[PDB]
Amino acid sequence: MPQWSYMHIAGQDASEYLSPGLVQFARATDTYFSLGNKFRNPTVAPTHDVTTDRSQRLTLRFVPVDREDTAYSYKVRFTLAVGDNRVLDMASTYFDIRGVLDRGPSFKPYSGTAYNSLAPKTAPNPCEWKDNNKIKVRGQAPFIGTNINKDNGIQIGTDTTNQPIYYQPEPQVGQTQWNSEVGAAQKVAGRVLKDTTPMLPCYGSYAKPTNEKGGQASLITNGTDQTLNEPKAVLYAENVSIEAPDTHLVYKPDVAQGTISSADLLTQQAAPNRPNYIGFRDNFIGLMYYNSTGNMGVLAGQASQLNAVVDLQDRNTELSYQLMLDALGDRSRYFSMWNQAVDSYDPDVRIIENHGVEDELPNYCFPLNIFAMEINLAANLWRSFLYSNVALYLPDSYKITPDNITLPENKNTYAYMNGRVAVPSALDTYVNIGARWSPDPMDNVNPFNHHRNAGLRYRSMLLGNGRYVPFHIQVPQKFFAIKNLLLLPGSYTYEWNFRKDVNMILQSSLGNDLRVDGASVRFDSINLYANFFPMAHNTASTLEAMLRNDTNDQSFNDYLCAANMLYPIPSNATSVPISIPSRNWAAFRGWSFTRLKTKETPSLGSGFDPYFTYSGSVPYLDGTFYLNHTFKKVSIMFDSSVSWPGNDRLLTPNEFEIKRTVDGEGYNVAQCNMTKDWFLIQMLSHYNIGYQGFYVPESYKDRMYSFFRNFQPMSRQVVNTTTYKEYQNVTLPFQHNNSGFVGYMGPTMREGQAYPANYPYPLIGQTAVPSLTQKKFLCDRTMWRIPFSSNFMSMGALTDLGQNMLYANSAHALDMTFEVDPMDEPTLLYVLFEVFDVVRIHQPHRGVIEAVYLRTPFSA
Amino acid sequence: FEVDPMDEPTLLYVLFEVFDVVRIHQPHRGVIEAVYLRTPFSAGN
């Protein structure tokens, strides 16, 4: 109506109602003196023909019409009926579980301790001795009292008087510190846990209290003591129920028999257990059975059984949906429905930089000149930093088990890991000090089990801190050919098979094998849920009868076009050769390879894989890769005669070299050890940079899972043995530094003496012994890429050389040989033969879908 | 209304009366379509 149009509330536009002369004086000067802001243009929504006017249903719900449960799988199928006059997008159909995961008696989702924390650590809860301790007066308690008549004891008052109850030291007194009042010449007491009760060390010590006033109490109640000179001070006592969720004695002084006991010996030491935030799998990986030819799924038309999902067991269709969430996304943002976290390890525990420890001034003491004491605050906060996020998570040797304590066999069990501890004499502020060098021992160790990692920390608390947890989660559809499919009206059968084995679908953070310590349970229920779109019907039946002709059909392509293969490597070996029979390469688009430890890769079939016993951030699936500094050189041969990068398009012609250690007549490229004509295939393949001016990759092309956001060159310096004349190699168990202000070979107490030391050869000072450097290049969280294009730069999705006649007009054999430096614990090699993987969908019969699949290289 | 002091919560149940009506019809083989008007206190914007 007019009164609207005049107010420019709906109708003419600020570029329409203006005298065209003054649109111009804006367009012509908007850079300075911009007044397009001053004006108005009404934005209105469509009047009609896009809205259902009768009773449609947003977020329609479906529940299983068929169910099947096996010892290690869950099978459901829904009659997903779109309904006539409608259109459904499966991007919004997410399945919705709900159960009762019992994480196991390992979740120590907190770090540190959590009982009587602030302890004086290693120390003894007032406990009584053994043999017949009724001979000596110990003396340490708190109440400050008056006349303990006894047969009643301590006291108090109320006009009459008041002997006590059941004495209370949830703190009690001395509240007058300075003067500490001091044995009010009179009786004053405390509590005492006496023998018969598990003599632990005051710390971690719980006690299911049972007087509701929080007394301790052995159910049948207990206490009382003194002798009848005369009365002096009393001590009530008991036989409670100590315990310690978190802890692991680290110097129980022998005396293996006579435990709940004491006799000094009993008072030992202690510590926190570690921390394995055991919670569910980012992307909800696994909870749905993806690529595997046994359990697989369906989505056909109740009317032909003609399925439309054929998942060849060789498309990691769950890396994809964890790379297609690196484009269209930014995994540094945690969503929560599709548990989207995304892992990561804090780049200050995988590339430690011993930037020292400031503290250039005397952290000093001061009891309640003045007598005192010190403590290198800012350094001690380094030792406890070092042997706690890094060290301890070291390899698996180089860790020492404490004496008189036995650990369970079946290595990698939670009772094993916290049984042993690292040594805070090496791999601490006394190693590669002042250098970026990441610790070599964990060079090739999955650095994703850190409790200091975000992402494994937004889900293990997102599910609370308990071993029992009733979950309520949604699992997005993850197949590439259905995830974004538009449906036509009709009745469909949506079927999928789930995993209910804990080890697969419940990532820990220490990889103790959940499957041996406890886990998941139900799948109490599993209903779909799909939000349709109130799309007025007249214009549905014209977006559903145009999407059902056949020149207009749909067509998804898996983002990570892969033909992934697994190539085993022996315990300690290199040069894994591989051969492929003669075949075509009509649309090959380059390789993508990496290395993975066998312990972290399932069999991909038959679901439950008994040999799969490690749960920590499966690289094969999570997308986290951490062995890319191990490769040495890769060769590609065609027909067994021509190198393939070759034509001389490279340096060292036949051998895309990656690193190249020592031997540098001059090629290592970056203050690092990559080889200048790598870092010209890698950069120039990802961020098409390279041949016209090595920039710093621009952002929107450095997305997490890509290069520059990784090559973290590093370098150090150590006593070149054959030059300094005394590279006495003093083995870790001999270094005497921090004399003994700190621990002995082991995270134990102060045994010390005090001499200078034997730290590291001082390589930064007036006398510094000589040297020899080293240089590594961690490229974690990504994969090497070797595009098939004639020039490694990428122009289109289909290489400039993929359609080359002699790669699409005849069959050829490919022989290629990797080379990796040895690593113990036999590993496995992973390679992608990137190849188009498109899929068309056609559906003319109003209730049927005919899907077509294709993989140009590797169609089998 | 001036109801008598009862004593505890107590909801009065006015039953404002209208004309309910439905006109179910099945033109094709398997299509139910019906209007559901209720006047004097209807349902519509």
Binding site: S541, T542 | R23, H25, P27, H28, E33, V35
Partner: peptide
């Protein structure tokens, strides 16, 4: 069809 109005058109 419809009861409210007997109007209907192809597209």
């Amino acid at each position: 069809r419809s009861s409210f109005t007997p109007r209907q058109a192809y597209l």
